[model samples]
Target: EFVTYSGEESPTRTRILSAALSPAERAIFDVPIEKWLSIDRSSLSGWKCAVPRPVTIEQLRPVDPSDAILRHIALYRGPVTDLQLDAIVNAANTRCLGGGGVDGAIHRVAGPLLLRECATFNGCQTGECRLTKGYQLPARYVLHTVGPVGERPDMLRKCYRSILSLALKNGLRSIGFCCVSTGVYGYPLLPATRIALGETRKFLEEHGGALDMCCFACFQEDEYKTYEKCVG
Candidate 1:
C-alpha cells in the first residue's frame, strides 16, 4: 500500500509498551503459522516476540532492573524551555521541515529559521535517523530521528536501535522520543508500545553507562498510562 503523511495531531500518536507476549501468543510469536492458528491477534496486541505470557504493564516487571541501565523515560510536559538537558529529539519527517506533532511543535517554538537547516538534510528515510542544530529550543542540540510507522510496528525496534546508536555515538546524554507514526501511520497501540519499550531495554543493555538518561517522551495520557503500567 502507498503511504500518506500529516495524520499527526498529538504526541500520543504512539505509546511505548514493555509488555512481552501474552501466554497463548507466546508459543505463537515466532511460530507465525501457529500464531495464525491459535492466537486471536486482534486481542494479542503486544510488541515483543519473546513468547506468550499474560502481560499487563503492571504485571510484567523488569527483574533486578538497574538505574545505571534504566532509560530515564519521561514525558515532555511543555516546550523545550523547561528542559535543561543536553539534547532533545524531534520526531522529524525525512524532510525535516517540521509539520506537526512533536516535530512541528519543536519547529514552531524554535522558529521558522530551523526549517532552513532541515531543508539541507532532506533524505531521511522512515526507520532511519539524522541530527540537526537546536536553533531555538532550550536544548543545546536536536537529534532529528525518523522512526518507523506504527502500522508496520515490528520495524521500529530496529529504528530505535539505529537512532539510539547514533545518539550515543555522538556522546549525547539525554533524549526525548516522539511516538513515530501511530495515528498517522496507523501503528496499532499494543504492538507499537511493546516494540518501543522492548527495543529501549535492549539498547540500554547493549550500551550500559555510555548513555545517562532517556525518555520515551509520550504525547498522550493513554500512552502514559500504558507505558507507566509497562514500566511500573
Candidate 2:
C-alpha cells in the first residue's frame, strides 16, 4: 500500500489493523503491525493493515502498591478545564498559539493573555513542552506540549516526561493530563495511554514526593475507560 495525507483529515490514510498476516504480507506492506492493533477501533474509519494484529494489552507493568506518588494519581471523567489542579496540560500543536480540540478550548477559555504569552515563547517541538500561566482559567498554569500524530511512542513518552520534568522544575504539583494526540493526531489509544501512564509512573518513582497528586482527566467515555483500566 501507499500513504496519503490531508491537512485536516487523515494524515496516514491507513488505520487498517492486521489480525494475522503471512510473513510475505508483512514485507509487502508499509504500516507497522502494532499501530493498527493499538487503535481504539471507534476512532478508525477504514481498514489498512496486511498483517495479523493482536489485541493491545490493556494492563500496564505493575508498580509497588504503597508507592505514594503513584498512589497520588487518579482518574477524572470530565473536561480537564474544570479541574483545579496546579497545572493542566494542553495537547498543543507546534504553533502553540491555538487550534482545535483542547488547544483551542484552553486558548479560548484562558482568554487573550494566554495566546499573547504563548506567542512570546515561540513554538514547541514534538515531545518537548513549555509552560505558561493559566491566566483566566482556574488552574495556575498550563503545560503545553505537542503530541505525535500516529507516530513515535518514544516521542509520546517524551511529551509526558518533558511535562512532568517541567512541573518538577517549576515546583508545580497536582497536575492533570489531557490524553495527548490520541484523537485528531491519530495516535492509537492503547499505546498512547500506556506511554502516558507509564511515563508518569516512572517519573514519580524516580523523583519522589515532588507532586502531591496527578490525574488523567478525559472528556470522552471510551477514553475515560482506558485511563481507568491503566491507572487502577
Candidate 3:
C-alpha cells in the first residue's frame, strides 16, 4: 500500500488532497485533459493566437510501425506538471524539500503532502532518483533526481538513466522528463540536451518494450529550440 500523510492541513493542502482523488479538470494552461495527446501543430497555431504563450508539442522521432523506440519519444514545450502521464521527472535538489523553478512549482501544485513524503527518505544524492506519489499533480507519480551544481556530464547522464530505470522498475509506461541541470544549476544547454536525448535513446534501444512513451518537457523557449536542433 502507498504511504499517506495527514495532520497539518492548510487550505492548499486540503484542496490538493481532494484534487489528488480525482482526475484533473484541466491541464496547467487550461487545456482540456482530453485534448492533451491530440494537440498538434495546426491546433497549436489556433492556441497561439488565444494564449499569450502557447505550449508547443513536437514529436522527436519519426513515426515508424516497426520501430517502437522511434514511436516512444517526443518533445513538449510546456510545464512538466501539466503532463497527464504515468509520471513526470522532477529536477530536484538533494534536500528535496523544494527549491525554485520546476521543484517549487511541482511541490506547490502537489501540496504539502509531497514535502512530508520526501522527508521520510532523508535525502537524495546527485544523479540518484527517488519516487513519490504525485499528490495533486496531473501525473500519477513523480521521480525526483538531483543534478550536479557544476558541469558534470557523467552525473547528468546518470540522472536520466536513473529516472528511466526507476520508471521501468515501477512499471510506469509513460514518463515525462524536465531538462535536468540546465536551470539554475548552470549546466550548458546544448550538452545537457544532447545527454538528455542521447541517454533516453540509448535506454529505449537497450530495453525495448519496457516503456511506452518518454517526453522531454521543456518550459523555456531556448530549451525547446535547443532540443529541436539537437534532436536533428
Candidate 4:
C-alpha cells in the first residue's frame, strides 16, 4: 500500500502495487509493469521517520521468514547464522559504518575479518546498491543497498528495480532484505511495503521466477506483524 509523506495529499497515498499482465515470465525485468498506485511527490514535505512494524512468519522459522515474504519486506535486528541463500541485503547507509541496530549487529556477528572485506569496497550510495563478499557471513555474498532519503519517488523506484535486477543478474537463487529508508529515511510502512513487495512480484513475474527465496528479517514483533500483514 502507498502512503503519502505528508498530510497535504487530499487522498492518503496508501495503495498496494499490482502485478502486470505478461505473456510469459522472463529472467530479465524487461517486461513493462503497470501501476495501480501512482507516486505523488508533491506532499513529501511533512515526512517523518516511519513508524516500523515488527514482522513474523508463522509457517516458517529462521530464514524461512525471509522466504515467506519473498521480495516485498522489511527486516530489523535478526540472527547472523548462515543460510543456504545466494546473498543477503545489508540495511546500510552510504558510509557502510555498520553502527546501530541491525547494521552494527551484523558487523559484530561477521567479525573483524568480514569488516576488512566490507571496507575493501568503500561505502555504498543512497538510492543505489553495491555488492561485496560475505567473508565470514553465512551467505555466499552480501548485497548492500543504501536506502533513499525521505520521499524521493524516482530513487525509490530505482532502488526496487535495482534489487530486482541485481538478484536475477547474479547467479543468486535466494536473497535477504533489510528495512531500507524506512527508519532514517522515513519511508513509512504503508507505502514502503507496497513498493518493496510490489516491485519484487513484478521482478519475479517478469523473470518467470528467477529467484526462489527472499528473506524479510524482523527482530521486533510489531515490525513483524506490520510487514506480515502487508506481504501475506
Give the candidate number with the greatest TM-score.
3
Q: Write the per-residue lDDT of candidate 1 for residues 4-121, one digit (tens) a residue.
A: 1112211222111223335543432333321232233335343222112322223222323455444244544333333534456666666556676777777765554356455543
* Model 3 TM-score relative to the real fold: 0.73
Task: Look at candidate 1 and tell me the lDDT of residue 62.
Answer: 32
Best prediction by lDDT: 3
**lDDT-based ranking, best first?**
3, 2, 1, 4
lDDT of all the models against the reference? 0.54, 0.67, 0.71, 0.52
What would the per-residue lDDT of candidate 3 be over residues 1-232, giving only the tens digit for each residue? 2212111114433444344421222222344323333344234322211123323233333334356565777777788877767778889987777889999988887765567567655557888888776656657678898989888999999888888877776567788889999899999999998898889889998988888778888899998899878766
Comparing 1 with 4 on lDDT, the higher-scoring candidate is 1
- Structural similarity to truth (TM-score) of each candidate: 0.64, 0.70, 0.73, 0.62
RMSD of 1: 20.1
lDDT of 2 by residue, 1-232 (tens): 1111101112111222313445533332323322322233333232222112311112112233466655667777676776666678999987677889998888777755566556655568888887776654556568898988887988898899888887787677668789999879989887798998888888878987887777787889988888777766
In candidate 1, which residue ranges exceed 4 Å CA deviation? 1-68, 75-82
lDDT of 1 at 195: 79
lDDT of predicted model 1: 0.54
Which prediction has more favorable TM-score, 1 or 4? 1
Model 1, residue 71: what's the lDDT? Answer: 29
Using TM-score as the yardstick, the better of models 2 and 3 is 3
lDDT tens readout by residue for model 4, 98-154:
657666665665544334444544466665666554434445456667778787766
Q: Which residue segments of model 4 deviate by more than 4 Å?
A: 1-84
